[PDB]
Amino acid sequence: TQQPIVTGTSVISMKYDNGVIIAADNLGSYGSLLRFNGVERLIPVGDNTVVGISGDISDMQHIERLLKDLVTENAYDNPLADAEEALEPSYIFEYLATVMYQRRSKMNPLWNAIIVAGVQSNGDQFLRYVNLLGVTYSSPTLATGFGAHMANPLLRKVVDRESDIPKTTVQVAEEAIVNAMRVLYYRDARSSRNFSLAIIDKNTGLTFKKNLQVENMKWDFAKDIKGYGTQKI
Amino acid sequence: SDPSSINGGIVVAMTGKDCVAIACDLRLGSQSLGVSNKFEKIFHYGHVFLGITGLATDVTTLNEMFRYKTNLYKLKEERAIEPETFTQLVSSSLYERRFGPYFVGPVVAGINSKSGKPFIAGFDLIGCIDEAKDFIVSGTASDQLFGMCESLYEPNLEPEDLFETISQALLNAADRDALSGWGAVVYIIKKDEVVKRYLKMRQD
Amino acid sequence: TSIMAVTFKDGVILGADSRTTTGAYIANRVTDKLTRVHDKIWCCRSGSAADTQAIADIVQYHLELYTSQYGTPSTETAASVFKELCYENKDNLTAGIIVAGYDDKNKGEVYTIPLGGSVHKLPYAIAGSGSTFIYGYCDKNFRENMSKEETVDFIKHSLSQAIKWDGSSGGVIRMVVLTAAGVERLIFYPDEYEQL
Amino acid sequence: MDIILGIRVQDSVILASSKAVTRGISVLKDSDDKTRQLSPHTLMSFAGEAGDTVQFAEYIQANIQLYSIREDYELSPQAVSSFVRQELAKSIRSRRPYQVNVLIGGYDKKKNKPELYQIDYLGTKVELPYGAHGYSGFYTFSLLDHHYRPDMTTEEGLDLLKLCVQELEKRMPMDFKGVIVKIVDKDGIRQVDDF
Amino acid sequence: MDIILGIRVQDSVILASSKAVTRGISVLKDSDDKTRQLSPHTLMSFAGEAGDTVQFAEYIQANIQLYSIREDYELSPQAVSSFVRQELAKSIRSRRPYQVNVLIGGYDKKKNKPELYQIDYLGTKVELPYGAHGYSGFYTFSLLDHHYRPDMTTEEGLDLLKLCVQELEKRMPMDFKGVIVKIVDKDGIRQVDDF
Amino acid sequence: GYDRALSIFSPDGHIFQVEYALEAVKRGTCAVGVKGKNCVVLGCERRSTLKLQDTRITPSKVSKIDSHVVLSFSGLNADSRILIEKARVEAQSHRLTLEDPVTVEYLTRYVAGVQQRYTQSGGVR
Amino acid sequence: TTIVGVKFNNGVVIAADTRSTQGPIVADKNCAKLHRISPKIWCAGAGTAADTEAVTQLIGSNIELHSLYTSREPRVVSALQMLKQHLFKYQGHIGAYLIVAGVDPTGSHLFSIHAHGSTDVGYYLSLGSGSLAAMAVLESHWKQDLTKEEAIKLASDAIQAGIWNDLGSGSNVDVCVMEIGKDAEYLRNYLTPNVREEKQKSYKFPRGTTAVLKESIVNICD
Amino acid sequence: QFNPYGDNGGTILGIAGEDFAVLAGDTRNITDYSINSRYEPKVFDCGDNIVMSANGFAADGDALVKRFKNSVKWYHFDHNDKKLSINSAARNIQHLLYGKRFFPYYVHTIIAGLDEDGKGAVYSFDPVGSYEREQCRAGGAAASLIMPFLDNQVNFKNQYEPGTNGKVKKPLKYLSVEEVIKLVRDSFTSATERHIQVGDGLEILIVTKDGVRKEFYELKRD
Amino acid sequence: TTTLAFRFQGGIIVAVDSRATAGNWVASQTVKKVIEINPFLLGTTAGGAADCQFWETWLGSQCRLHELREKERISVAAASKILSNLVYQYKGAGLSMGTMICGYTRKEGPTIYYVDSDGTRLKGDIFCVGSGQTFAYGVLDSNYKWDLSVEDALYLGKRSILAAAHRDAYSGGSVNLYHVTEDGWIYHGNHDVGELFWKVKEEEGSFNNVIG
Ligand SMILES: *[C@@](C)(CO)[C@](*)(O)[C@H](CC(C)C)NC(=O)[C@H](Cc1ccccc1)NC(=O)[C@H](CC(C)C)NC(=O)[C@H](CCc1ccccc1)NC(=O)CN1CCOCC1
Ligand SMILES: *[C@@](C)(CO)[C@](*)(O)[C@H](CC(C)C)NC(=O)[C@H](Cc1ccccc1)NC(=O)[C@H](CC(C)C)NC(=O)[C@H](CCc1ccccc1)NC(=O)CN1CCOCC1
Ligand SMILES: *[C@@](C)(CO)[C@](*)(O)[C@H](CC(C)C)NC(=O)[C@H](Cc1ccccc1)NC(=O)[C@H](CC(C)C)NC(=O)[C@H](CCc1ccccc1)NC(=O)CN1CCOCC1
Ligand SMILES: [Cl-]
Numbered sequence A: 001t002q003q004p005i006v007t008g009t010s011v012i013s014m015k016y017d018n019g020v021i022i023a024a025d026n027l028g029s030y031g032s033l034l035r036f037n038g039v040e041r042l043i044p045v046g047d048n049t050v051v052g053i054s055g056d057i058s059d060m061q062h063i064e065r066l067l068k069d070l071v072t073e074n075a076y077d078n079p080l081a082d083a084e085e086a087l088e089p090s091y092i093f094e095y096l097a098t099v100m101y102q103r104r105s106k107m108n109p110l111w112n113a114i115i116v117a118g119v120q121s122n123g124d125q126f127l128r129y130v131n132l133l134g135v136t137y138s139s140p141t142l143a144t145g146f147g148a149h150m151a152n153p154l155l156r157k158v159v160d161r162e163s164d165i166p167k168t169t170v171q172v173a174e175e176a177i178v179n180a181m182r183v184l185y186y187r188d189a190r191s192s193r194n195f196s197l198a199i200i201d202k203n204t205g206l207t208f209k210k211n212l213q214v215e216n217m218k219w220d221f222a223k224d225i226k227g228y229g230t231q232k233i
Numbered sequence B: 001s002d003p004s005s006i007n008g009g010i011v012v013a014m015t016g017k018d019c020v021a022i023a024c025d026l027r028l029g030s031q032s033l034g035v036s037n038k039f040e041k042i043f044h045y046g047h048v049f050l051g052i053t054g055l056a057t058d059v060t061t062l063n064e065m066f067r068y069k070t071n072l073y074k075l076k077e078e079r080a081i082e083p084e085t086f087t088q089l090v091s092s093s094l095y096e097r098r099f100g101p102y103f104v105g106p107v108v109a110g111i112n113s114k115s116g117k118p119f120i121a122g123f124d125l126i127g128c129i130d131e132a133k134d135f136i137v138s139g140t141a142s143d144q145l146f147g148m149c150e151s152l153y154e155p156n157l158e159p160e161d162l163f164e165t166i167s168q169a170l171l172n173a174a175d176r177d178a179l180s181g182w183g184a185v186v187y188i189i190k191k192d193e194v195v196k197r198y199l200k201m202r203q204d
Numbered sequence C: 001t002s003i004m005a006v007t008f009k010d011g012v013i014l015g016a017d018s019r020t021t022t023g024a025y026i027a028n029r030v031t032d033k034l035t036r037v038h039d040k041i042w043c044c045r046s047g048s049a050a051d052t053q054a055i056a057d058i059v060q061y062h063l064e065l066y067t068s069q070y071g072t073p074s075t076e077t078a079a080s081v082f083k084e085l086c087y088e089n090k091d092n093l094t095a096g097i098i099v100a101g102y103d104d105k106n107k108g109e110v111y112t113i114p115l116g117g118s119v120h121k122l123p124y125a126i127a128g129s130g131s132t133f134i135y136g137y138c139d140k141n142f143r144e145n146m147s148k149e150e151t152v153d154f155i156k157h158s159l160s161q162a163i164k165w166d167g168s169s170g171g172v173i174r175m176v177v178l179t180a181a182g183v184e185r186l187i188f189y190p191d192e193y194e195q196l
Numbered sequence D, E: 001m002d003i004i005l006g007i008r009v010q011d012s013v014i015l016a017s018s019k020a021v022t023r024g025i026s027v028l029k030d031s032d033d034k035t036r037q038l039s040p041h042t043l044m045s046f047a048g049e050a051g052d053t054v055q056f057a058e059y060i061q062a063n064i065q066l067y068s069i070r071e072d073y074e075l076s077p078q079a080v081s082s083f084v085r086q087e088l089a090k091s092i093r094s095r096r097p098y099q100v101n102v103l104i105g106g107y108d109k110k111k112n113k114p115e116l117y118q119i120d121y122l123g124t125k126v127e128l129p130y131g132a133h134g135y136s137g138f139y140t141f142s143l144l145d146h147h148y149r150p151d152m153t154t155e156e157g158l159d160l161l162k163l164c165v166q167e168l169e170k171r172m173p174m175d176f177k178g179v180i181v182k183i184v185d186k187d188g189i190r191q192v193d194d195f
Numbered sequence F: 001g002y003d004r005a006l007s008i009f010s011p012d013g014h015i016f017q018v019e020y021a022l023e024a025v026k027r028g029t030c031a032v033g034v035k036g037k038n039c040v041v042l043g044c045e046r047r048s049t050l051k052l053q054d055t056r057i058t059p060s061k062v063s064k065i066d067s068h069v070v071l072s073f074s075g076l077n078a079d080s081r082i083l084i085e086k087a088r089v090e091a092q093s094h095r096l097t098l099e100d101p102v103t104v105e106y107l108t109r110y111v112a113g114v115q116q117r118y119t120q121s122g123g124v125r
Numbered sequence G: 001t002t003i004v005g006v007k008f009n010n011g012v013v014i015a016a017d018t019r020s021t022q023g024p025i026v027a028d029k030n031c032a033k034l035h036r037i038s039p040k041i042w043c044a045g046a047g048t049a050a051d052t053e054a055v056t057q058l059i060g061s062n063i064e065l066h067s068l069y070t071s072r073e074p075r076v077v078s079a080l081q082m083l084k085q086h087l088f089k090y091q092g093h094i095g096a097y098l099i100v101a102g103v104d105p106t107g108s109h110l111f112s113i114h115a116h117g118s119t120d121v122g123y124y125l126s127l128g129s130g131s132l133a134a135m136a137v138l139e140s141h142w143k144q145d146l147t148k149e150e151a152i153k154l155a156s157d158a159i160q161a162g163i164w165n166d167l168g169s170g171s172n173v174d175v176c177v178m179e180i181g182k183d184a185e186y187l188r189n190y191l192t193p194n195v196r197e198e199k200q201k202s203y204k205f206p207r208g209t210t211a212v213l214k215e216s217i218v219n220i221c222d
Numbered sequence H: 001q002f003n004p005y006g007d008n009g010g011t012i013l014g015i016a017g018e019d020f021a022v023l024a025g026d027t028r029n030i031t032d033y034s035i036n037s038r039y040e041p042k043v044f045d046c047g048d049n050i051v052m053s054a055n056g057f058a059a060d061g062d063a064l065v066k067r068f069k070n071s072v073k074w075y076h077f078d079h080n081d082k083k084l085s086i087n088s089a090a091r092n093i094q095h096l097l098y099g100k101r102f103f104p105y106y107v108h109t110i111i112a113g114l115d116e117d118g119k120g121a122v123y124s125f126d127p128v129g130s131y132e133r134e135q136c137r138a139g140g141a142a143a144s145l146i147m148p149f150l151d152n153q154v155n156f157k158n159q160y161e162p163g164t165n166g167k168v169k170k171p172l173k174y175l176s177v178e179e180v181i182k183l184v185r186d187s188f189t190s191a192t193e194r195h196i197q198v199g200d201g202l203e204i205l206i207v208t209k210d211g212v213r214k215e216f217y218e219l220k221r222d
Numbered sequence I: 001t002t003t004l005a006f007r008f009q010g011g012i013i014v015a016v017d018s019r020a021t022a023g024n025w026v027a028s029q030t031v032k033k034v035i036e037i038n039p040f041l042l043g044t045t046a047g048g049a050a051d052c053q054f055w056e057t058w059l060g061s062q063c064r065l066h067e068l069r070e071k072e073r074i075s076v077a078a079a080s081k082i083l084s085n086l087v088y089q090y091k092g093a094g095l096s097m098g099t100m101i102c103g104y105t106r107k108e109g110p111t112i113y114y115v116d117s118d119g120t121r122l123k124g125d126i127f128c129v130g131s132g133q134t135f136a137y138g139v140l141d142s143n144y145k146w147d148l149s150v151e152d153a154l155y156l157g158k159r160s161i162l163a164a165a166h167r168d169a170y171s172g173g174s175v176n177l178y179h180v181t182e183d184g185w186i187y188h189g190n191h192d193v194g195e196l197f198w199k200v201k202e203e204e205g206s207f208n209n210v211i212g
């Protein structure tokens, strides 16, 4: 039995024609206090997988160490560690999914929602979700927390089903992700303006973008809004 | 101690071609104990029919109340109340007891004598009107009735065909609910004739 | 919420953020928490949106009826009416209100009214969830008889920090200036105040 | 208060009511009559919360007797049962409801028919050929389902009733100290002294 | 399980135990023997939580019989009662205690004296001239205080016991379906078939 | 715990520890069992090099396992007590669970099983 | 529910889905959540279904009497004030979450009311279980100086986001357009993107399938 | 306090024919009022002509299917590649479920296939391992809606022979794979209409002596 | 559930209903509540479905192991006590089981043991177990005699379940009959209440409360 202390908010993601995109803001909230601002919640594993984590940050750091250790363990007695026997996104996910469900079964969960985004060795896009309960699911778009409520609707307008994936380019897909992050900054009280974004492409590989900011915001209309009903001044 | 499921029971209403049907089971129990197999849940005021499920004392009370109100209506208005008007009266009366409500699931059914249009409606316990073209369901086996009606129903059924559909909807729903059954009654309502049929069903 | 009111040489300035929340969802990002109860008597609202609105509406009614009979009310009188409502209905209210007004005799005045319904007359006042993070800053930086431009900078810098740390505060920074000249509304957007 | 039964036969209604009054680990009385005569051809048995039962029964009795004097006329069992139901239907939404369950056995002189009504504390009325309140029903209903016939005589009804009491005395946990049996017919109300 | 009584007289110990086994609103059995013979001159009656009672009684029985075989010798009633008390004294601080109250009636062959011990589920032992467990004591103790004499015969003890059962049948709320009576004396244990 | 395998096979396929245990039995006082048409009789030798004995209190050679079964033996006297105790416990355990006293075959099978277990358990002879 | 309101050039538009739930069960697949307070003041309602209908009718009744008393067309702020004070008095127990909109002599207006009696002003608003799905669309596509046709499109798109993504919302899209100087146009079932597909089989029974015990003619006449 | 269970919604359905058996299930996965996936399969081919679904709490459902699939694998290793009969699978699943009697798998399990005589078989399980072979079973969120319809249409309950005075029952007969799929599709479209947690897509797995075939159909996405 | 079994002149009658519920939801009408442990032993099941079925199938395995080890069929007493000792170990853990172990052996004769999940074990001639046990008792007790014929005893057992199936909301479906003799148990068919009620009503003239 736990309660989460230092927490990370939404992680959002989607598939596009050649790969996957995933994003998450750089905030570590302490209740209503926006305590830590330099927190990286996207953690790359190799050059073909990115694990995005929301929820308790102490448990996130534990999971970082596990993934870091997984890379080390895989390299042991493995001449093809950087080739055929490298870590796949599906291997990394199944490992985490096993841990998450084992921990919930011992009534001592890792208080997180996790999205494993990556590209397999055969070029196939990988995007799957797992949380503190060990619940797993996959979809063309995936999001956690407020992202599930606000981002998914916007991302599903681009990729509503499987057949829309080949029709979606990396430019269009990233534009939708960046737009979603802005909407979350408008509407999520535990979000920040600063965020990180990662693209895993089957051709161009892993592109990790840090220190992005929400921009092109609409605030000007606020000056016209006065009172709560009858006020004119 | 959930008022709506102490006594048990169900009501279902359907529309057809120039006709409506309303049907109910006959069980009244006290939780597991079956007490009465003659407890009818459908009443009528003139040509307007009202079915009521839920707490049996409130079913009886509301029947007496709507008899009271429709009798005065008729004396003052010098005409029988219509289903559309009666529906509003039921809604008003239930919402009047918003914070101390009658634990019931009423269902209005009938044919407007002026326009000839078939009419059905349902309500929650605080009077929210649920109007429908096809069917209305109510009672402890409402989930079962929703499933039966949504699959069995088709529009513009003749009175004789409509009877079979509503009867099979009620019977098979009731057999999947412990607190419903013990007999059933079906009213077939045409513009100026009404037929009442008691169904044969399993008595467990 | 983050709200404040600050007296200065020419009068008084009220300041507030624009965030309204339901849990962690922002129901309104462009809220106006600075509200008129009289021509030159305004208030900053914090706590329950429903309660503070209901209260402000009643106070506005009382001061309008006061004006019809006895002429313009004092800022102290307005604060008293707020107190009377907040104190007598303390069991059923969640309202943290700052009353600010401009008389010609008394100049700029600020009264703060916390949850209990007590009244406190102060040179400046801060309130709302985000105020906790700027007690240190505001105490160190406030000076009496500041200029208009200094007071605007003081409020802007203060609420900027409150917004930065408090998740329950954000959006635009609204301000209302109360002087002998009249009533002036000011607004400041994220792109300006965030990078202060 | 615990066991009250009722059986409507061809020409009469028979009410059987337990004699025990218990409180704690003590049977305070073993000869209690859990019934009141509402009118010459209407009898009401009762069971439920201590105090409430008698207070309610006598209140109803007073009201029906008042009606009889005013109109110089006896209300029908159907009319009385409806009056009783309404009183309980009011009661259930009061500050402190009457926690009383009743059976109303009467003989309608206009119809020349016996009538048995079962009403619970919620105001739930049903006309029945046989009725019971409390845990009694869990044994007697199934028993009567089997042995009851609508054209039975009063004597056949009493034997049918003996069969119920025997079953209750065999399988009920509590000692209810036997029953007082009363018969309601065209000649009014009378008590069976040897049961 | 409910009523267990015990009376020590001049030359014997008499145990009376109710025959009813009740569950919910159903008397499942009316001929239950709530006792086990621990040894030829020692008898233990029991009452308490369902399952626990018999499980405990037979466990004690097994242990005493094991002792008898090992030593080719019968333990005294005092020795058996102390063994039983200790088992209950252990039990009360276990994860799940035995919720069982017992009476141990025995005839000490070395002393030529009858002995009655009352032990509750906590492991509270007392030697008594007469004993009871549960709500029975609230009637029988005062009754025995009045009518009991230490020099009574077995026949006088049975009449004294009949007086207790009659009082319990009059004032107890529940129907306990009579009692099985057993006598423990110099000639061993025997059951009174007509009570 | 002491784990040593004391009872083990030898090249010729014999377990010497079991066979040497038989020599201990051969040393023990004679015991005889004869069953008639309606009875069984257990006879037992007692060596007469021991005078000044107290026959009241000296352990008897025949032991009751239950009220209906008896056990006599030949060999080490101290060892026999352990088997008798186990057998008596099992006799009461059987009555408790099966609600019926042991058969003579069952009780024998149990005692024999205990003896076998000590021929292939570590740390025991 | 999903409900929205969007201001435009010469007026305001509101919209709503048409799902009514009872736990996880869809009770009404085509209920009307757009309510008429006065001819040119309309209300979209979410929350407790009876409450939204009752509170809107009561205030609509009083607004009519007020309009007759004052010999004036009713104002949105009057409906707003009367609703919020009523809801506040009941301390949130009347579970009505409303988007109030309309045109009057003062101009065009758009407000929201919550069950506890707090009101908000805005150019675009959304309430109900699918408000987050709707607000995401509104925040992404709204701009200043919308036309009539652009506002209807934005409003219905916001409702559609709720319909598809929120389990609490579904079925159709209702719309009401309130433009200055014109009659308000109520567009019942403006979109119907959730039509039931043809069933695989007819379940019309052979006549006489159901076993009957009794028949009787019922007397409805005097 | 931490709650180890969750409700992922969805509903499943098993029907058995003479020489075949179907196991259907919608592809929607949900939590509360949000959709997690429009296509997340929960009906699985487990080998030996056994199809399985464990609907309810998906994490427990996946765990169980995963464990049974593994049980089938080890059954081959330990018993000379012997085919696991449907009746033997059912009993094995009972022990899997009852093994966690005091911390249950929150799922309604259904398996389908062919018995050892080559006839269609459907088994259904409660969360703690009680099982029963049936011709017909619906499970999950919309089980209460679908099941009574199946009683009527598959087992012909409450249906009598016309003109026989309700004395002769409609005679039981096996349904064709074509007729069964019609009933499955109509069951799921009806459930989709009236249950919020049911929709998006329908995936049917058909089991004959030839093997395991799949069919997919769209469902309403609101 | 409603289950009963009574002892009489011609052996033992055992009768059960077939309903299974999850609250007010009627989950099944075709459950097998008599478990055939061997040709001479039967067990009934009331309460938690999984608990009864799992532990009574397990009981059958334990009884099979007994006759392998002892070269003799287990006694009804010993079989019932294996089950009662098992559930007693789980006492407090929340098992819900109301069962009756019925059978014949040479030493015991026809024997019935009531065993439940709180450890109670009782030998007796008549028992009714389940949510509708009281309804079954009412009919059974009022018509029971030791000298009933095999034909009359079978009917009484059937009629008693029917009575409970009718009145008890959580009982119904169909009646499963068994007759246990010195030669073993004999199955006497599945009887759907749907047809059995009306058949009994008409022929017997009972159930006058119901609209005919
Ligand atoms: C900052 C944010 C905090 O001090 C400011 O003070 C602002 C003040 C401005 C708006 C005047 N306060 C709020 O935004 C205020 C915060 C709050 C919340 C709860 C109690 C007191 C204060 N928010 C509100 O008042 C919202 C406004 C609505 C969404 C338009 N109202 C609610 O959150 C209501 C309040 C109900 C209530 C509870 C207790 C006392 C008084 C009122 N609550 C809900 O709707 C509950 N909601 C249901 C779904 O689950 C999340 C919670
Ligand atoms: C979306 C769908 C939900 O977010 C919308 O907000 C719509 C608004 C439209 C319809 C105006 N809301 C609903 O559909 C609403 C959801 C809801 C449910 C429960 C509480 C609050 C909101 N549904 C209803 O209001 C239904 C309307 C019926 C189907 C006509 N009513 C109920 O579900 C009632 C609730 C009554 C109630 C009483 C006291 C306080 C609050 C609500 N519930 C029942 O009828 C359930 N039950 C049936 C058995 O009899 C006893 C009552
Ligand atoms: C009569 C019919 C009255 O119960 C009998 O006693 C029968 C005996 C037969 C079946 C052997 N008993 C039941 O039907 C029994 C009643 C009951 C229910 C719950 C606890 C104890 C007793 N019913 C069951 O055991 C059902 C059988 C199913 C329908 C096949 N099982 C459940 O209700 C299960 C498992 C219960 C459970 C026990 C212990 C730990 C966890 C769970 N529960 C569910 O399926 C829950 N629910 C069903 C509705 O859909 C959502 C999930
Ligand atoms: Cl506000």
Ligand SMILES: [Mg+2]
Pocket (backbone or CB within 6 Å): B174, B175, B176, B177, B178, B179, B180, B181, B182, B204
């Ligand atoms: Mg039923």
Ligand SMILES: [Mg+2]
Pocket (backbone or CB within 6 Å): B203, B204, I164, I165, I166, I167, I168, I169, I170, I171, I172
């Ligand atoms: Mg029944």
Ligand SMILES: [Mg+2]
Pocket (backbone or CB within 6 Å): C163, C164, C165, C166, C167, C168, C169, C170
């Ligand atoms: Mg902030």
Ligand SMILES: [Mg+2]
Pocket (backbone or CB within 6 Å): H191, H192, H193, H194, H195, H196, H197, H198, H199, H220, H222
């Ligand atoms: Mg749906």
